[PDB]
Amino acid sequence: MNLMITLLTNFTLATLLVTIAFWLPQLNVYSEKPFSMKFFLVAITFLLFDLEIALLLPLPWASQTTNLNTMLTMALLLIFLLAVSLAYEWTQKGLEW
Amino acid sequence: AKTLLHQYWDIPEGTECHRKTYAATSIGGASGLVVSAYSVALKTPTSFLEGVARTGRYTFTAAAIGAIFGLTSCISAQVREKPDDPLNYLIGGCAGGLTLGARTRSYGIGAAACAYMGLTAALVKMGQLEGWKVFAEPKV
Amino acid sequence: MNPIILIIILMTVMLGTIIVMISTHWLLIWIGFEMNMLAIIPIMMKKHNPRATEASTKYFLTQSTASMLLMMAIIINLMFSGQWTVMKLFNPMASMLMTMALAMKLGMAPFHFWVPEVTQGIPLSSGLILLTWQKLAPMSVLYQILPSINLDLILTLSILSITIGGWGGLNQTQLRKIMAYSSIAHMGWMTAVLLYNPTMTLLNLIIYIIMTSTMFTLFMANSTTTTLSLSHTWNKAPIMTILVLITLLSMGGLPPLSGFMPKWMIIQEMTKNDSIILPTLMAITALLNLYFYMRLTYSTALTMFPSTNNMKMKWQFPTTKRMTLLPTMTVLSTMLLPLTPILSILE
Amino acid sequence: PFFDVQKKLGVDLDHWMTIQSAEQPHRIPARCHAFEKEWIECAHGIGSIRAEKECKIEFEDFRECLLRQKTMKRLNAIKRQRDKLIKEGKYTPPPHHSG
Amino acid sequence: PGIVELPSLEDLKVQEVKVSSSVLKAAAHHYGAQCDKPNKEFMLCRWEEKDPRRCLEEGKLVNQCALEFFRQIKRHCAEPFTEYWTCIDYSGLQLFRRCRKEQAQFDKCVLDKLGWVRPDLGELSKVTKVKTDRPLPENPYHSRARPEPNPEVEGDLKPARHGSRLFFWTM
Amino acid sequence: MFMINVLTLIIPILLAVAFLTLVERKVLGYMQFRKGPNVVGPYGLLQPIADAIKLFIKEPLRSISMFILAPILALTLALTMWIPLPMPYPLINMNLGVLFMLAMSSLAVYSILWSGWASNSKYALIGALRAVAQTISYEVTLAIILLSVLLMNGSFTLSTLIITQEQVWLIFPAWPLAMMWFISTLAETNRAPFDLTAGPFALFFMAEYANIIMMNIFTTTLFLGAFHNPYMPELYTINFTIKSLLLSITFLWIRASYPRFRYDQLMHLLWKNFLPLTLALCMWHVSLPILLSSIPPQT
Amino acid sequence: NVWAKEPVLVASFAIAGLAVILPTLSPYTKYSLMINRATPYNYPVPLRDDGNMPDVPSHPQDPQGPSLEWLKRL
Amino acid sequence: MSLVYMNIMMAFTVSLTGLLMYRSHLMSSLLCLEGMMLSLFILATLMILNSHFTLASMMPIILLVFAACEAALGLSLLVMVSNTYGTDYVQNLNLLQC
Amino acid sequence: MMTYIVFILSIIFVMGFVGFSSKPSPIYGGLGLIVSGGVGCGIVLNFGGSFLGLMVFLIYLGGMMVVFGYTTAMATEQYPSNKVVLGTFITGLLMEFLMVYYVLKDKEVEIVFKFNGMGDWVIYDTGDSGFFSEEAMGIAALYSYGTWLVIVTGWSLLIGVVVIMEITRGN
Amino acid sequence: LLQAEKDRRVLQMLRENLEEEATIMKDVPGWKVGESVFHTTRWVTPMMGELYGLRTGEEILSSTYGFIWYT
Numbered sequence A: 001m002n003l004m005i006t007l008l009t010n011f012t013l014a015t016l017l018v019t020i021a022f023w024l025p026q027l028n029v030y031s032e033k034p035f036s037m038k039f040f041l042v043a044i045t046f047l048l049f050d051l052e053i054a055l056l057l058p059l060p061w062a063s064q065t066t067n068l069n070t071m072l073t074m075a076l077l078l079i080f081l082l083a084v085s086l087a088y089e090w091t092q093k094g095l096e097w
Numbered sequence B: 001a002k003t004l005l006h007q008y009w010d011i012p013e014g015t016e017c018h019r020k021t022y023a024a025t026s027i028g029g030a031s032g033l034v035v036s037a038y039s040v041a042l043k044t045p046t047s048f049l050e051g052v053a054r055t056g057r058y059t060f061t062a063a064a065i066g067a068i069f070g071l072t073s074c075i076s077a078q079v080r081e082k083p084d085d086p087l088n089y090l091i092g093g094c095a096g097g098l099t100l101g102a103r104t105r106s107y108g109i110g111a112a113a114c115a116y117m118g119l120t121a122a123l124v125k126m127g128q129l130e131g132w133k134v135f136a137e138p139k140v
Numbered sequence C: 001m002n003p004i005i006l007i008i009i010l011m012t013v014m015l016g017t018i019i020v021m022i023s024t025h026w027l028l029i030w031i032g033f034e035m036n037m038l039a040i041i042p043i044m045m046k047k048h049n050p051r052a053t054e055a056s057t058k059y060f061l062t063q064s065t066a067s068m069l070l071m072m073a074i075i076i077n078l079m080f081s082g083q084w085t086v087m088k089l090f091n092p093m094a095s096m097l098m099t100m101a102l103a104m105k106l107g108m109a110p111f112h113f114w115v116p117e118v119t120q121g122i123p124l125s126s127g128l129i130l131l132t133w134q135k136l137a138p139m140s141v142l143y144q145i146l147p148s149i150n151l152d153l154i155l156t157l158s159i160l161s162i163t164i165g166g167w168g169g170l171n172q173t174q175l176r177k178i179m180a181y182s183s184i185a186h187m188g189w190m191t192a193v194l195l196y197n198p199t200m201t202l203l204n205l206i207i208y209i210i211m212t213s214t215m216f217t218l219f220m221a222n223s224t225t226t227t228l229s230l231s232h233t234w235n236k237a238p239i240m241t242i243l244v245l246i247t248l249l250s251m252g253g254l255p256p257l258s259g260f261m262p263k264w265m266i267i268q269e270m271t272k273n274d275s276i277i278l279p280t281l282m283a284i285t286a287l288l289n290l291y292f293y294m295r296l297t298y299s300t301a302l303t304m305f306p307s308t309n310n311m312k313m314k315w316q317f318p319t320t321k322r323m324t325l326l327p328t329m330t331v332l333s334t335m336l337l338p339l340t341p342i343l344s345i346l347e
Numbered sequence D: 001p002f003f004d005v006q007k008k009l010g011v012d013l014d015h016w017m018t019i020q021s022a023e024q025p026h027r028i029p030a031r032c033h034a035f036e037k038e039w040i041e042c043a044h045g046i047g048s049i050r051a052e053k054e055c056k057i058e059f060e061d062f063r064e065c066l067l068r069q070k071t072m073k074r075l076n077a078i079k080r081q082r083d084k085l086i087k088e089g090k091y092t093p094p095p096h097h098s099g
Numbered sequence E: 001p002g003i004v005e006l007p008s009l010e011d012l013k014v015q016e017v018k019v020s021s022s023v024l025k026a027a028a029h030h031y032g033a034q035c036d037k038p039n040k041e042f043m044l045c046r047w048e049e050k051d052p053r054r055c056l057e058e059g060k061l062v063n064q065c066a067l068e069f070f071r072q073i074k075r076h077c078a079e080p081f082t083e084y085w086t087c088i089d090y091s092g093l094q095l096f097r098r099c100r101k102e103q104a105q106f107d108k109c110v111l112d113k114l115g116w117v118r119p120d121l122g123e124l125s126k127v128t129k130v131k132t133d134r135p136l137p138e139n140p141y142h143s144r145a146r147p148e149p150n151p152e153v154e155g156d157l158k159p160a161r162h163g164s165r166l167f168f169w170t171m
Numbered sequence F: 001m002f003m004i005n006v007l008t009l010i011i012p013i014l015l016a017v018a019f020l021t022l023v024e025r026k027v028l029g030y031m032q033f034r035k036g037p038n039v040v041g042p043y044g045l046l047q048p049i050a051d052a053i054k055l056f057i058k059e060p061l062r063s064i065s066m067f068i069l070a071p072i073l074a075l076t077l078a079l080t081m082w083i084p085l086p087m088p089y090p091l092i093n094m095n096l097g098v099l100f101m102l103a104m105s106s107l108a109v110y111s112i113l114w115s116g117w118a119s120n121s122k123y124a125l126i127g128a129l130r131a132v133a134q135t136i137s138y139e140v141t142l143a144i145i146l147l148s149v150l151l152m153n154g155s156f157t158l159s160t161l162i163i164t165q166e167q168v169w170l171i172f173p174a175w176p177l178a179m180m181w182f183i184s185t186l187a188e189t190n191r192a193p194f195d196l197t198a199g200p201f202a203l204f205f206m207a208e209y210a211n212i213i214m215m216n217i218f219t220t221t222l223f224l225g226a227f228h229n230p231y232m233p234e235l236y237t238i239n240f241t242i243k244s245l246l247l248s249i250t251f252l253w254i255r256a257s258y259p260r261f262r263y264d265q266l267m268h269l270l271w272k273n274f275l276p277l278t279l280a281l282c283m284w285h286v287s288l289p290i291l292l293s294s295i296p297p298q299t
Numbered sequence G: 001n002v003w004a005k006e007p008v009l010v011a012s013f014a015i016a017g018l019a020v021i022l023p024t025l026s027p028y029t030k031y032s033l034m035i036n037r038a039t040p041y042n043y044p045v046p047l048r049d050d051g052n053m054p055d056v057p058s059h060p061q062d063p064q065g066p067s068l069e070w071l072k073r074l
Numbered sequence H: 001m002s003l004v005y006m007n008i009m010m011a012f013t014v015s016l017t018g019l020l021m022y023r024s025h026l027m028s029s030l031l032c033l034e035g036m037m038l039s040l041f042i043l044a045t046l047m048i049l050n051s052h053f054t055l056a057s058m059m060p061i062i063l064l065v066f067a068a069c070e071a072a073l074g075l076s077l078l079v080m081v082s083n084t085y086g087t088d089y090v091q092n093l094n095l096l097q098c
Numbered sequence I: 001m002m003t004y005i006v007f008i009l010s011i012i013f014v015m016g017f018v019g020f021s022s023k024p025s026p027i028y029g030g031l032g033l034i035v036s037g038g039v040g041c042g043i044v045l046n047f048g049g050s051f052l053g054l055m056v057f058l059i060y061l062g063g064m065m066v067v068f069g070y071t072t073a074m075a076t077e078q079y080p081s082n083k084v085v086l087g088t089f090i091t092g093l094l095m096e097f098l099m100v101y102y103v104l105k106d107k108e109v110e111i112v113f114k115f116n117g118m119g120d121w122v123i124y125d126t127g128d129s130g131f132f133s134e135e136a137m138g139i140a141a142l143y144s145y146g147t148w149l150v151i152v153t154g155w156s157l158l159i160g161v162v163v164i165m166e167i168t169r170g171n
Numbered sequence J: 001l002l003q004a005e006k007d008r009r010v011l012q013m014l015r016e017n018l019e020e021e022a023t024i025m026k027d028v029p030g031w032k033v034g035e036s037v038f039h040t041t042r043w044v045t046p047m048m049g050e051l052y053g054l055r056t057g058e059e060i061l062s063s064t065y066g067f068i069w070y071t
Helices: A002-022 A038-056 A068-091 B002-010 B019-041 B048-079 B087-103 B108-130 C003-022 C027-040 C050-079 C092-106 C112-120 C124-148 C151-167 C175-191 C198-219 C227-236 C239-252 C260-271 C277-288 C291-302 C326-334 D005-010 D033-042 D050-054 D056-066 D069-088 E021-026 E028-033 E039-048 E056-075 E080-089 E101-113 F002-010 F012-031 F046-056 F064-080 F098-118 F123-136 F139-151 F159-164 F176-188 F201-223 F234-255 F263-290 G007-024 G029-037 H004-020 H027-050 H059-083 I005-020 I026-047 I052-060 I065-075 I083-104 I135-139 I148-167 J002-024 J058-064
Strands: E128-130 G046-048
Touching: A002 F002, A002 F064, A002 F201, A038 A068, A038 F123, A038 F139, A038 H059, A038 I052, A038 I065, A038 I148, A068 F263, A068 G007, A068 G029, A068 I148, B002 B019, B019 B048, B048 B087, B087 B108, C003 C027, C003 C124, C003 I148, C027 C050, C027 C124, C027 H059, C027 I148, C050 C092, C050 C112, C050 H004, C050 H027, C050 H059, C092 C124, C092 C151, C112 C124, C112 C151, C112 C175, C124 C175, C124 C198, C151 C175, C151 C277, C175 C198, C175 C260, C175 C277, C175 C291, C198 C239, C198 C260, C198 C326, C227 C239, C227 C291, C239 C291, C239 C326, C260 C277, D033 D056, D050 D056, D056 D069, D069 J002, E021 E028, E021 E080, E028 E056, E039 E056, E039 E128, E039 G046, E039 J002, E056 J002, E080 E101, F002 F012, F012 F046, F012 F201, F012 F234, F046 F201, F064 F098, F064 F201, F098 F123, F098 F139, F098 F201, F098 I052, F098 I065, F123 F263, F123 I065, F139 F176, F139 F201, F139 F263, F159 F201, F176 F201, F176 F234, F176 F263, F201 F234, F263 G007, F263 G029, H004 H027, H004 I005, H004 I083, H027 H059, H027 I005, H027 I026, H027 I052, H027 I065, H059 I052, H059 I065, H059 I148, I005 I026, I005 I083, I026 I052, I026 I065, I052 I135
Parallel strands: E128 G046
Antiparallel strands: none
8 A cells, every 4th residue: 555655645746736737827817719551550460469478478487397398399389479470461561661 | 027927826716806917917017018128129219208108008008918818817707607717718818819909909900819819828727727837847 | 361371260260169169178168269259250351342341340249249248157157166167057147147148159039130130241151151160169068068057048049049030031032141040040949959958959950050051052053142043043054943942941841851850859859858839839930930941942943933144145154163062961961861860970 | 069189189288277176386275175175076976966966065165165155144243243232332342452 | 053173272372482583584494403303293293184273282392392492592602693693684585695704603603512514405305204103094184985986887788679769760 | 754755756856857858958068069058057957947937837728638637647657657666775665567667658658649639630649649659569679678688587576686787787698688678768768769749848748758767777777787785775876876877878869869760661670670689589588598507596 | 692681580580590499409408407396395295104215314414315416516 | 255246247247238238339339348358357367366276377367368359350340340431330330231 | 545445446446337338438438448447457456466467457458448549549530418428327326326325334235146245355365375476376387287278379369460461451 | 383373373363253252142042152154074274354353454454465565
């Protein structure tokens, strides 16, 4: 709850900074007066590589176990599949401009 | 639903009159709520007031079916006094069908409603009298 | 697309349904359903019209919410007695949600609103593969989880599926909606037995799959989607007429023909219980869903509709189509009356 | 169906994700380990319906180990009796900060 | 339902080893070295019967061996043992590789004045046999008997009696 | 005392970012032939202070809830993102903190997209959408490279990292991985050569440069530094601060020199040059400890 | 050849191929297996004496059981 | 029954009704599907963490990465729908009439 | 600021789910779902929760709402309220307040269950010697045990990539 | 040693709790005083409400939720 106290203090002080930015000047003086496809490919590309990152990233917590051969095997299989997806969109001229 | 149909069959046949009609109006109001829910959720009647009108009309007709069915059920059971025939409830289902034809204002269609609702009421009383297991045994 | 890419995607449909078949775990079953969805999307929209776009949209929304409701049922099952084994559940509510999720998954009459709409605006290969494998996948799960189901759900969905698949179609002339309504009716027949003896359900599944393959192969004999095209198939070739005749009449369920065998044996192992009102209701509606079959027959197989020239132009050219396996499946799916004791092949 | 390539090749590719009480990697237990061991050893060569009939006691014991339902029921009852007697004022409680 | 068995404070009163974290952590190798020969009796008690309210005697025994151990280290060398654990104390989570000089000083202390060669790696490992007085009991899981055996349907098979015994298709 | 810790963190962020602005302006000035600024007060300190004041008294004008909600998220990230940074004794001993770095960088991407939506249907919002796309194309590279540089460190705890950096620096076992990661820090700070891109401009500007100081402090901790000697942590604090300062001056110094990319050249370069090289260096870092028999002590 | 065309690709496939193949040559994977197996986490359980084993040393000081000595000797 | 589970399942049901009834767009429907996904994730995560169900702790992360790629598929489909029109309304989908 | 902090964060969690399942404009819905994901992360980290909850927070908040708001901003407009939206919010708020009423003022709440609504520190461990986590060796499986599962997972994701490019105009 | 301390302490909590339950429910119908709700009379591990009941806030916060958000 200590970090909740930190989040609360930072949020409240930042809101006070925003209200100093807005409601400070008391001198109320004079009030006066299409999308593309290739944007969308980048987001889903990021999304699927992020999902395979989520699959990869608990690797170093796993490094203390006995079945080292299967670990190294499926780890190389995961990075290889990720690079195969990248090479697939690379050779099928997908993310090009 | 289940508890109030069990209330209806708990009322003997037998003469515990117009509680039978209360239970039958409750059954008809439930069935009218079912079919009215389908008819308002599958149509968009444009607008909400007309939807409430269609639901009230459907529930009123179905409760009228149940009411007049239970009334002539009690009338057969008190006048002719044969408690365990399918014939009285054949007459009862015909009465419910003819009053449905009255509330929809169609005559030959009301006669068809008489025929089919009387045969279904005869089936219900007849199979319940002999004892025919609903929906399943479910054993083998 | 590429042919190698289609090899890979159909391989993944095979792999997804096999993972549904093979695991004793729940997560792999849900992954198999999801991979089935993900790989069956690009088989639809194989052409480039917005018809297939809206069909794929409807299919994705219904398919996705069915998978999510299934995962809800599994997590409720582990809120109660906790293991990931595919056996009897431990909640009426979880089994209730699970049968409803599988009912949205395959298509019952409360949930059948997406099936004709997705099967119309798609090419025929997509419709064939979705019908065969999407009715093949959940029946394995139902076969495994059967001893924990309240009979009111399966019974109500089965009765309602048979009667709505009967009553729909009598206004309909598009052949894909006709075949989808027939799919709803046969899935109701496949469902109504499962709490009594599931061997009949998987046998009816085999028979219906072979019949559907023969049906859509004879609809792929040439590019036809309406009945008047079938009248042109009458005047361009005589053998397609009698083959469509016999396959339609086997979908009808007549005793000297193979499609009667799933009906009658279901009636038998139904009525070795005291169920009589249910067979007579199901069989009167099985009389009902033969009328659209019979008006298709009366249209383009035994009456002779007037045709149009340039069929004269079409007479010069051979039928250079490919058939996956047409005649084998046809005569195996029609003349299979005296092999009724191949019931026991299924154990 | 229920196909058994799972048993024909004989690979435990799925028989570790399955229940509790299997071989956890660092050999740590679950919360109701012995209850699962007793209920499974009650229900091994058992035909799945007499499993309901004749493994009732340990299955209910496992369920009330997992959810801990009646224990929370009894705890709520004791707390509400505590509330009504502190409303009464008898023995302003020496459970807290004393034995 | 069934009543419980809670042995009261009649047996639940032994004076605790009320020393703190860092001193107990820095005294650990000699604590496991000389004593903690009979605490494996306690641990074997605990794993052979997983019902504490049973092993109270050997819990008392390991408590008094720990108390005697600290008495023996208090009367003899060292007083710079106190220097050693206050050296290791304030280093956050206690890396044993921080304080080494006074580790050597305490080593020479204990070896010259009393002995106790420090247990090397991996001597606080290596699964160990020990004896008790009681034999290990059956079903510490208070388990009932087996529910039922399955009557094994076995024996050689006859051919099909009168075929399928369906409506027809005989033989 | 804990709120006093919070105040001693987030009161020098204002002075830190403002004096960072004077430092970068003076440094760019001496990179060119400029003494800018020195006239306005003693060596230009009151000029950033009073200029921040003037920026607070600008009186601007104007969807309003969205326009509220974007810079508040940006600056609360700028506040709440110096928590586990282990200037010797960190504020919160998080068991994992690097994944918290990644999550709050994604929250900064939220901030940029909310500002772009609040910009009210402009060719600027199309450009801000492109900036959101380029900013989101980097957390793949940063997470995977960060994963590899913690792989030689066992745990996510970052105190284990300050243990690992005692013998030699971690810049020597992974220098090209570190080079790619530093280019990704240039990338995440959304400054030169990686550009382009209303109010409150002081708060948004504050968020960007506190994000810069965070990335430089995290760079300095991740790859090099000094030894944590207890009962005098200020020595480590001084040496860490000097190295982080030199790295931040180098960071602005590399910004002082090169023209900015093309957007499609930026994407082309990112994917087709960093991303296979990340995967190859990362699989080599996976197979490295099994071929040196040195897996770190995951406790 | 392709060394001027996409050189970062060539270096990537080179370090990838050595990262795949290179675990086949090692005097150290057995050392990795011994380290990662012989680190105790849980409690080393006791057991009943009367199996009459010429192993399982009754004293933790006693080196009659299988242990490690190559650790301190690197 | 660990009363946080009560209103988690309640909010699940409300998320499911949000997936079902919707009147203007489809992205909001897909977003409520994502919220339902979050509900399943949270419920399974709290259960497996309560039970010390340490061996099969794969369930919440694998559940969310799979239903994540499901949502990605839904995004691509809605982009194709919005690209063959100007908008993404529930309306202008009434073609292929029944 | 009491015992029921997990319960209060659960209440705010249900508030956020009602906030976007009251059918607002979809970018407001994305805002409410960001709120919901943050407070669900708070709930799971209250159960500790150290690894998996803040883990998939990256994937859920760090990977999904950004793409949803991306596509929502670029595709359609709704460029400048209705009684149905605020009425759904009224009904959700009323059912939430009714649940608060029946929890806090009664014994138990049963829709079709048995919820004992009280201090949910139960259930919890009695401080065992875990020394890593549950989540640590938990997700530090999938590699010594997960042969089949991560293979079919990565295979499904590769098929997901090729499906996406096909739909968005393969090749 | 710590294990034996933990065992003595949890038995002490159970003994205190059952004595105070015997007082606090002295005139209620039903309520057998020592109900193991589980039929199998064995050792079962308590669930921190069986241990840390009747404490009102402080020590239950430091015990149930102490490690979970310490620092």
